[PDB]
Structure 1
């Protein structure tokens, strides 16, 4: 019979663009696996849920998935939506592989039914710090975040890395997501002579901050995590995007092995360049690999199978640890441009 797979992330709300990547990836993976035969003849059927990357809606989606009888979830997208959902999946015996959530705590609580194909901010944070310390070498640093699990997690991790090396972090502060007016913060960066800012959060805020910064003449170097590194960033920020630093996964679209899938997305006129197309595609491949190899429909048998034997995916040969995290997932540093391109820093 058909095998239902829930796919969960933002299809509404302020970061729906990251969701667009996720769904585009999941859909192409499901199509490709079904075109190749399915799972010994059984077709994968994607069942899509919008959690708006909102913790309360995520919980409602998780409860709906349980009620719907679905046993496998590729989701959720954001850390603060994925973690409360994971509590329900774990309790109910449902497999959950997140292609998006990077915050460490998800997989540090002993859970057995949870995995990711996303990286960890316990790696992303230190990488930013190292680059800041060793290459940027700033004089006066401010660290800003959006008071949310992902962004504040990362802002804390970078502060910790920088303060370990006695760097001059002048202040640490939160802003409210959705904020369109950064004139107060920007005046502070100017008056306090801040030449470097790290912002833990997502592109809508980062873009507005960059545009407003350059409009008053601030020359401050900004940096953020992969959450800011979107085609939207440069549209929102304008020429102010130029020079922004971002940590991001490898450019899987440039791997020659993916040229066929790149072409598939291109024939649909979908953008293939975002890392999360591939990271989601790889979660679907992972689940499919487990289903094919085990012949089991048990979530825990599928998770045991991936942790023992791995999967070959569009983001490379995958190996997971006993907590459900990928070994060897690294983030690189990139320099953004007004036209939305980016170069290795």
Structure 2
């Protein structure tokens, strides 16, 4: 029999541009999987629903999906819609894989029918530690943060990773957001011969730190999370932002293995650059992998199978933890330039 898969997101409202990315990625994945034989000859059929990223409509759509007899949902796109809908899908035993990326609590409620293919913002911590250890290979590290949840969380994760690998974290310290005078910190970095700094925080502080570091001839390599990557960074720091490392999502449309999909999209006059194209494509590939590998139609069997075995996707190999979040998923690492551009690795 045909296998129906609901695809839910914004066809209307303020989030429609991202919704278009989602529906385009799901449609292409379905076509591609069918052209390779479907699920042991059975075709996938996408059934699209617009929830306008509106909670009330999300609930209407979820109830319609239940009534329609559909067992698998790729969606929804926004937190305010995915959250109430997921309550209905969990109660009804319907598999839901979301490509939307906000709200950690979605997967913290013990739901067993829920999964995501968007990596959590916090994943940047282990990803940075990995790059520092495999590629940078610094000798004397300092880790700095601005005492706020975002930056301190990430700096603590980087510290844990680096310490776990026996790296030399010389010191770990917090600074005050809004700080314009980094003279004491930079002088300490120089005296302690620090060759690498990870800064958990935002671009204004990073830019000030970089300007002051270069003003005293520090050769230190700096790195931070996406929050330091801003077009007004190189504005504060000038030439001093050159060479800064930053984690940001990988540009999946640049992966050579994805060029077939990039071409199909461009041929249909669809922009392939949008991250939700790829994240949604990957959710479909994950579902298809589970259906193929298990031979089962039962949602829970599929979720357990993916948690156990993972899937290969257009965003790379994926693995999930027991709560349905991705485990060990990597943002890319980019080198910043004085002109605000950034290149991979």
- With normalisation by structure 1, the TM-score equals 0.65
- Residue 126 (structure 1) aligns with: 126
Contact 1:80-1:150 at 8 Å conserved across structures: no
Q: String of CA shifts for 1:162-203, please: whole Å, max 9, x gaps.
A: 999999999999999999999999999999999999999999
Comparing 32-41 and 170-179, the one that deviates more: 170-179
Contact 2:123-2:328 at 8 Å conserved across structures: no
Unaligned segments of structure 2, at least 5 residues: none
Q: String of CA shifts for 1:30-60, please: whole Å, max 9, x gaps.
A: 0011111111111111000111112222111
Check 1:135–1:12 CA distance in 2 against 1; reply closer, same or farther (3 A cut).
Answer: farther
- The whole-number CA distance in structure 2 between the counterparts of 1:267 and 1:274 is 16
Contact 1:121-1:154 at 8 Å conserved across structures: no
Q: String of CA shifts for 1:233-289, please: whole Å, max 9, x gaps.
A: 999999999999996421111111112111221222211112221111010001011
The CA deviation at 1:101 is 3.0
- The whole-number CA distance in structure 2 between the counterparts of 1:40 and 1:122 is 38
Aligned structure 1 segments of 4 or more residues deviating by more than 4 angstroms:
124-247, 332-345
Comparing 252-261 and 129-138, the one that deviates more: 129-138
Root mean square deviation of aligned Cα? 7.1
Contact 2:318-2:329 at 8 Å conserved across structures: no
Say which SS state the counterpart of residue 52 (structure 1) adopts: coil
Check 1:159–1:321 CA distance in 2 against 1; reply closer, same or farther (3 A cut).
Answer: closer
Contact 2:152-2:200 at 8 Å conserved across structures: yes
- The whole-number CA distance in structure 1 between the counterparts of 2:65 and 2:182 is 39
Say which SS state the counterpart of residue 109 (structure 2) adopts: coil
Q: String of CA shifts for 1:100-121, please: whole Å, max 9, x gaps.
A: 1332111111110000111113
Comparing 195-204 and 123-132, the one that deviates more: 195-204
- The whole-number CA distance in structure 1 between the counterparts of 2:51 and 2:205 is 20
The CA deviation at 1:298 is 0.3
Comparing 156-165 and 25-34, the one that deviates more: 156-165
Comparing 265-274 and 296-305, the one that deviates more: 265-274
Say which SS state the counterpart of residue 134 (structure 1) adopts: helix
Check 1:294–1:139 CA distance in 2 against 1; reply closer, same or farther (3 A cut).
Answer: closer
Contact 1:103-1:121 at 8 Å conserved across structures: no
Unaligned segments of structure 1, at least 5 residues: none
- The whole-number CA distance in structure 2 between the counterparts of 1:300 and 1:144 is 43
- The whole-number CA distance in structure 1 between the counterparts of 2:258 and 2:314 is 7
Say which SS state the counterpart of residue 13 (structure 2) adopts: coil
The CA deviation at 1:303 is 0.7
Say which SS state the counterpart of residue 179 (structure 1) adopts: coil
Say which SS state the counterpart of residue 282 (structure 2) adopts: helix
- With normalisation by structure 2, the TM-score equals 0.65
Counting matched residue pairs gives 345
Check 1:113–1:146 CA distance in 2 against 1; reply closer, same or farther (3 A cut).
Answer: farther
Check 1:315–1:160 CA distance in 2 against 1; reply closer, same or farther (3 A cut).
Answer: closer
Comparing 202-211 and 276-285, the one that deviates more: 202-211
The CA deviation at 1:122 is 3.1
Q: String of CA shifts for 1:185-239, please: whole Å, max 9, x gaps.
A: 9999999999999999999999999999999999999999989999999999999
Say which SS state the counterpart of residue 231 (structure 1) adopts: coil
The CA deviation at 1:330 is 2.9
Check 1:284–1:167 CA distance in 2 against 1; reply closer, same or farther (3 A cut).
Answer: same
Say which SS state the counterpart of residue 179 (structure 2) adopts: coil
Q: Flag the structure with larger Rg.
A: 2
